[PDB]
Amino acid sequence: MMLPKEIMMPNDNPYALHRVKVLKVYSLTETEKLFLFRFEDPELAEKWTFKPGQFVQLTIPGVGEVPISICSSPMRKGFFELCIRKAGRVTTVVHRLKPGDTVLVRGPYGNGFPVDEWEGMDLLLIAAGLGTAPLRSVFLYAMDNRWKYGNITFINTARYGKDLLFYKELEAMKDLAEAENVKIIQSVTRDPNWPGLKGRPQQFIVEANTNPKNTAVAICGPPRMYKSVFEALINYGYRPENIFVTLERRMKCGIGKCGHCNVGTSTSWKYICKDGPVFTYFDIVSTPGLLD
């Protein structure tokens, strides 16, 4: 968002960090934990609002900072949630955080999904692997604002059945969601012994309950699945002007100075922290190299 004096401090320092406390730790998968945070400043906690799809810079003191997307809805005011996978140094230190500990956060950064201009149209969310958390934010924003959006579909896929993000929440939500114009599809790709569904999301796009001409599509996951998902969506009649995807590059600041999250070419040179992380379909089509 455009929060003043709390996103850049009264000292006008964009690198200034806010003190937050971890209240709940929940292990989703083996290398995955869901963290519930709140700002130790009550006014800052009550004033901090974000957009679905935006990210924050989580500074573990003495180790470094990492960019994490927000998975909770912005209308759950006071608290925000982060889902973090153990990939290396900083995340190894993060996974040792027990409730009641204090960590530093600045944000929110980037542009989220344009959920304000998605008013009065269907929602199709396609989440692969770790991309469920930003789409969890979008999904919970849609569920809190159900009267605004039409039929919504949530496709969540993972390599194994134990690596599905928010499997318990989405499985518990499926009842009364099927009656509330919400369809949840959860599938695995490399697990042929999984009792549930199997296959890639492009197989389950046909099983969606969304009107193809009036649907907003949000895709999050590895860059390699994007081309196949684009082919499937274009074949079924989803308009290319409504397809949105998220990309990841190396980030050190999140404000546009370190120059590490660069994509594109000399014709269209862009930065993830300033021009994304949400990109449109035509941006992905025009310049190669944004995928893989």
């Binding site: 003495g62 180790v63 140094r89 190894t92 230190v93 040792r96």
Partner: protein
């Protein structure tokens, strides 16, 4: 308290001396318990359980291979300190076999102790982290010890000395005088000491890992300025004598 042990293989004790001459070492005593460091302590026990083991020197004795196997058994983290432990040091500059050097130095006499050619510690055990230099910088020791005390680990360096040479504004010896500077392939952290004093880098901190040390490009640059192949190879193998990349990469550009 973190249990730290400093062990001496065949070395000049430069790394232990560098750690001992730091004024910040007085801050390590309240936060860490030094188990084995014979240079400063006399009550130090060799066979004890240490959280982090710092190993100095090359493996130039059979008893040293037994000691490093014991250290790997007894340590949760094994850290190789210095060029001698990381890449064999300057003792591995010569490719001549052990008996030739022994006959040249000690003549035809017996010592009853068994020596061997200088090899890095990584050949006999698994070193989790490395500290580079000869001797390593005080900043390297500070960063490594502090990150270990916080529970993290140091970040490996994959950038050349030229980075710190260009941050400090030092004149480039390779562009002006054509001197054989090994800086473009040597790991940073020394703040470009030798190029800042007008000398050329001899690569004490070692060549960059992760297969991004370009000896072929540097050999071509040296070849344009009138150096034979063997001079370039000896220069690059001064501290990188256990590197299999150097010979192949230079012979590629000279073929």
């Amino acid at each position: 308290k973190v249990r730290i042990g400093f062990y001496a293989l065949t070395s000049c004790y430069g790394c232990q001396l560098q750690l001992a001459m730091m004024d910040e070492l007085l801050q390590l005593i309240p936060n860490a318990e030094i188990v084995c460091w014979f240079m400063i302590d006399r009550d130090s026990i060799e066979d004890e359980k240490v959280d982090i083991a710092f190993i100095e020197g090359s493996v130039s004795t059979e008893e040293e291979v037994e000691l490093v196997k014991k250290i790997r058994e007894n340590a949760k983290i094994v850290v190789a300190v210095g060029a001698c432990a990381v890449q064999g040091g300057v003792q591995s500059w010569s490719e001549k076999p052990l008996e030739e050097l022994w006959k040249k130095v000690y003549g035809d006499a017996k010592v009853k102790f068994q020596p061997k050619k200088a090899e890095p510690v990584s050949k006999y055990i698994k070193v989790d982290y490395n500290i580079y230099g000869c001797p390593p910088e005080k900043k390297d020791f500070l960063y490594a010890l502090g990150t270990f005390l916080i529970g993290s680990w140091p970040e490996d360096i994959d950038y050349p000395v030229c980075l710190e040479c260009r941050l400090n504004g030092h004149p480039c010896i390779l562009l002006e005088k054509g001197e054989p500077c090994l800086g473009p392939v040597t790991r940073a952290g020394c703040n470009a000491r030798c190029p800042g004093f007008g000398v050329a880098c001899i690569g004490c901190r070692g060549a960059i890992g992760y297969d991004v040390a370009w000896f072929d490009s540097l050999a071509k640059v040296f070849k344009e300025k009138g150096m034979t192949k063997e001079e370039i190879i000896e220069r690059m193998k001064m501290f990188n004598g256990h590197d299999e990349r150097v010979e192949k990469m230079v012979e590629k550009i000279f073929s």
